[PDB]
Amino acid sequence: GSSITTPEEMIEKAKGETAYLPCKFTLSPEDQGPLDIEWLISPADNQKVDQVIILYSGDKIYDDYYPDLKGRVHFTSNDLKSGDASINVTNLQLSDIGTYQCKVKKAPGVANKKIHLVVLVKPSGA
Numbered sequence: 001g002s003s004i005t006t007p008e009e010m011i012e013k014a015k016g017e018t019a020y021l022p023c024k025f026t027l028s029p030e031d032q033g034p035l036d037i038e039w040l041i042s043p044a045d046n047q048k049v050d051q052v053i054i055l056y057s058g059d060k061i062y063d064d065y066y067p068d069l070k071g072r073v074h075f076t077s078n079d080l081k082s083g084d085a086s087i088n089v090t091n092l093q094l095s096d097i098g099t100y101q102c103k104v105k106k107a108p109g110v111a112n113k114k115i116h117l118v119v120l121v122k123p124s125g126a
Contacts, residue, residue: 033107
């Protein structure tokens with residue numbers, strides 16, 4: 001019933017650099033529910049596991065408003081209503097490491113895909 005491109009994913013970027021996370025949800029006359037996007041992160045290095053950091057609901061893109069990863073996990077899509085729910089992480093870092101879950105909620109089709117953020121070693125940057 002649902003349709004999502006690149007579900008399970010792994011992204012590796014240099015610390016301090018922005019890590020792009022692509023999410024493309026399919027559109028259909030059926031998807032009459034409000035457009036929604038969600039991102040959970042589980043830091044392998046940190047004690048944290050599965051926590052909300054960036055979301056997009058009610059036309060409000062949440063990332064900077066969200067304490068978790070505020071100011072970084074920014075949707076590169078300036079027109080998410082086009083099916084693009086992608087968010088990139090600004091100013092990467094070692095603690096940013098951790099599995100990411102991209103879930104686009106749009107009735108009657110909830111989209112969910114995996115994105116693992118891996119940070120390569122490089123100068124501070126953060």
